[model samples]
Target: MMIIVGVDAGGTKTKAVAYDCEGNFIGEGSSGPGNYHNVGLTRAIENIKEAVKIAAKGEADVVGMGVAGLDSKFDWENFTPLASLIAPKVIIQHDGVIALFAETLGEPGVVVIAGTGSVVEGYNGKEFLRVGGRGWLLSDDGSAYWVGRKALRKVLKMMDGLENKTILYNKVLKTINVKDLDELVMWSYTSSCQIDLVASIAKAVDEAANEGDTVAMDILKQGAELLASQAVYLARKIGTNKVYLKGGMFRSNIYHKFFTLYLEKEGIISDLGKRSPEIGAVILAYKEVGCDIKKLI
Candidate 1:
């Protein structure tokens, strides 16, 4: 039985799944972060190889990988040769690209990702377009990081008496275990504070929203609107109403409902992804080998 391997190597984790030519899921494996930019090339390759070995049981005919930080032509050229060492045929793409294929199964559609960061990507069979993946410095609007940053800013504003006190203010303070504004201020500027650390505060915001905090609800509403607008913008450009939503932020039913409502207002319908991105990678592997996914499944 010919076997194929799919790897989704994101900023946080690396996952691998294996299947036979007939699309029967045979094995699976997981490892630590595998993005070369974040974890370095050596660690990245090691984790990918380890995951694939566990999933494929030492052999695979084809491998397709969707990796975070594999964003440039140079990145592709630098890593493709190393990835090729693992399989006879190798396909590599950005995490977002694989996500698009993951939802659409290689068809045409738009995908909005709102995890640690945010990006809107779309494919129209003949071309691809992307918007608002400019990183935290410029974009990543409506992402967890964005929401967390907003919450922190609100806390600061409330502390300074510039804004009214809100549940987010207290929630963020509690979430970070800071007793008062001074501690938060110090922590915010300290070198130990990282983007991911800040982004984690988004969960507090979600929790607050769940408990009927209007401030949190408003923040989430704004975030949902921002993300939905991006999807609608891309859908207009691509002329497709099929929008797929992914990322941790959407895990909140409130956020999902708000985002879907916004999309409906724009005459676009959005749904959660049908499969995990690793499975999308497997589908890509089948396509890379010129095998029909429908027949295999």
Candidate 2:
């Protein structure tokens, strides 16, 4: 049977799934980072190929890939060669669009992902647009990393006797496995990836909020509002009030409530993305061949 493979190439990991032309699942594979900007082009290409080989048994009739940092036509040109090596026909798109496509199945909509990192994206049929998610340093305002960074600041203020001691204080301390501010500072600067280390504190912040810690709740609410504002802006640009939510931070009850409340306040409707995003890559590949996957299934 002819097989089509779908790859979701993320910043942290690359995932690929294979299915027969009629949509029967054949295999699944996983590998390392695929963001060429972060991991470099050669490594990204190699990881993508590694995943596709495992999923499609080293070959397929067609392969669809959704890649992170596929921001421009120039980036596409750099990656199209990898596609040629994988299959006879291949389709590639930005990972953000694939997330949106998975939710709306090609319908126009907004998709906001707030995990260790964050990004807000919209599709207006003719084009895919990005708002925010400039990464940990420049933007990513409502990301887990953003909330975690704020949590650390509060801890520092409390240590300096500038703020009240709250449940968040202990939560942050426990999260990093440190006993005091001195250790915390030492751990932060010495941690291999300071960004990921700080982002790890977000889960603790969420737990503190769940325990009704005012400071933690405020931090999460502020982050949610920032991201919600971004979503509203993107929706207006794409002329749509509907949005699909994605990622781990959104799984927090408090964060989810706050984000949805802000969206509702602006008359924008929000829905959780329920489909596996890799399937969006498959959809794109099938569409490239001028076929409807749903009908084929």
Candidate 3:
């Protein structure tokens, strides 16, 4: 009775899914943020454990996790205990790697994740190539945070009368619960460390765009264009024009439209990744044991 558990420890949330030996999904669970860089290693581990326990309900023969912020050799060294803490054994991978596997099932292709942060990665069976995913500080150019930040910048310009007024002015002000530009400035400095709070304003950007706000539409288009550009570069570098997309920003039709437009222009075909990344972790876990669950199921 082999029970395999897969976990996607994202910047915003941690999700765990369990499958029986026959590839039957048995249970699933969700918890708080799992990125140690944001939530602290202890809290991240606790969240992952809570979700995995709820999903598995019993001992798991295999446990595989794809964690955000698990970059660099130093990060790996710090997180290697992740497996020991979860199960008797475990597989640790970066969130993008598992997302790529989720889309291509370990085949050669690129996967772009654009949640609160973003990363573009491609696997060519032999090696992995990546772009972005550095975090909101330097990279993550096309993520939800990026879109929100872009909208806020434009809102400021509009308030300053430096840019044309658009619905985003009122939209962002309301989203941030600010009565005026002065209040908006206060809030930005007050909660500057809360990346997710800033990222939340992206919903307003999408809403305004959906309501036909040209300014909002332009912001989303810019973000999508950047994401597509990175994905195209990786897709070509990996020698595969196939790409898969995952994350919250792509939920906006306007963003998706622009992203796909750019990809099409570059002769790259992209589809939203269908298989949940946690399920991809499961497949990768099975592979580590020299087994293929997809073939069995």
lDDT of 1 by residue, 28-66 (tens): 999866767646788888889889989999878888998
Question: Model 3 Cα displacement at 146 (Å)?
Answer: 0.8
Best candidate (score: lDDT): 3
The whole-model C-alpha lDDT of candidate 1 against the native structure comes to 0.82
Worst 10 residues of 2 by lDDT: 191-200
Local distance difference test scores for all models: 0.82, 0.83, 0.85
Backbone clash count, each prediction separately: 0, 0, 0
Tens digit per residue, CA lDDT, model 2, 52-79:
8899886788888888766567887887
Point out the higher-scoring one by lDDT: 1 or 2.
2
Could you tell me the lDDT of residue 226 within candidate 3? Answer: 90
Model 1 stretches with alpha carbons more than 4 Å out: 32-61, 78-88, 174-177, 182-186, 189-193, 290-292, 295-297
Worst 10 residues of 3 by lDDT: 288-297
Q: Give the TM-score of candidate 2.
A: 0.85
* Candidate 3 residue-wise lDDT, 1-297, digit = tens: 777889998877899998876778889989987878767889889999888888998667788889888768888888777546778769988999988888788888889999888999888799888899877888888788899888888888888999888777888888889988889879978876777777888999999999889989988999999988999988888888788989888899999999999999999988996788898888877887666666533
What is the lDDT, from 0 to 100, of the residue 75 in candidate 1?
85
